[PDB]
TrEMBL record, chain A:
Biased composition, class Low complexity, residue ranges: 77-95
Residues of the full protein shown: 72 to 439 of 641
Region Disordered, residue ranges: 77-96
Domain of life: Bacteria
Disulphide-bonded residues: 52-78, 182-204, 296-317
Domain SabA N-terminal extracellular adhesion residue range list: 1-255
Keywords: Signal
Record protein name field: HopQ
Keyword Signal set for record: yes
Amino acid sequence: SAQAINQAVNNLNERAKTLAGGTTNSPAYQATLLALRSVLGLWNSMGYAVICGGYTKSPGENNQKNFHYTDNGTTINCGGSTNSNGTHSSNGTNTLKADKNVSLSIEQYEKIHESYQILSKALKQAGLAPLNSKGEKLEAHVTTSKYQQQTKTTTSVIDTTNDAQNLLTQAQTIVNTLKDYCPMLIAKSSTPSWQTAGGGKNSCETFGAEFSAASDMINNAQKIVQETQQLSANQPKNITQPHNLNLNTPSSLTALAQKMLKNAQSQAEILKLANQVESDFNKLSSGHLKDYIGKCDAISSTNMTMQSQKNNWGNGCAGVEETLTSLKTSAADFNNQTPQINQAQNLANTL
Amino acid sequence: AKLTIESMPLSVAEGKEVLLLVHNLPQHLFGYSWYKGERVDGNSQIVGYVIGTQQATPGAAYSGRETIYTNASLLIQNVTQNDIGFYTLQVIKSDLVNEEATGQFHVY
């Protein structure tokens, strides 16, 4: 009947309006946000240990580049080394070639740093834009340094946006750079439990599971965004003039009936993906990073210098536990609306 | 304590070989590199080795008779008079702290 078709269409559209354009009420949103925050968390937890500044063309093109992190700010030197007596050396990691299972090039580190800074600044300056929203433009700042014949600081401007698609791309760059090139990690001088003190572990050796989980979080979050635009551009129209057999022809009614199913199947896959992203967060957060990624509140390395002596390296400082609960609290609201959704799909299956 | 080099033989004959042994190599390394001359200088790099890798990456100074080993020693065969003088090893330990050491052999 007309009231039944109209009740189902309204339920789909009410849930679709929240799922697509909502923030705190949307598990699609909170899942995406979790993915983003999880990569920031990953980098904040173990980024400082990533060995960088191996040479790309030659050992005689000896380059360095320092990368700044602001907060209680810190700086990370790629290329150099620390001498026996404690002074800085311009010959260090740049004496050995950059590749898989060795060291990130300066070029690879500057992408992680750029991506991280865009992502960090976007989530603070403007939050994540809603998933159906086109996004809001915003300027990111990226502060680096080189050495001269004196040290030269340079802060770059990047015109970026806070739409999921862009922000997921930045996260993807961080995870895939680690996942694919597996740079070695710095050890303790004889701090997290995973940073050994003995030899020095390979990042994909230490964080293989975590990198895959972090990677899968992004792939699923992107899939959420694609099913959300499918959903957005697939809104069934309410039946008006119900008795009018010319206006409401069985053709454009079966069109609507299967337009409703596309709306429902997107919502299913989105909620399914969102629940996978939570499963993927548990994979990420329950190995080496269990006591680290979820919290925030003095650790060092020889390629690191702090403005003060505090800094927040070693633990995630990305509000992932807060976002995890928001994802759980939003997903149970949609998980109990399934009776309404299954009433509509069975009703739709008729036409 | 200190990283030191030893040339075997100490003085070499032209066309024969020399072995720069490494004493007191610290455990736990990221990698190391051998240089021609007194200075750690990129353009004089003969070869660099990374601990996980299995293969060593030569530099500009690689003449083609240099065999680095994974105990950090360097064999140089078919020595010329042009091989006279100093050779320098830089080690990068796992904590990114470097150590240096110089070697020399005299050819006759």
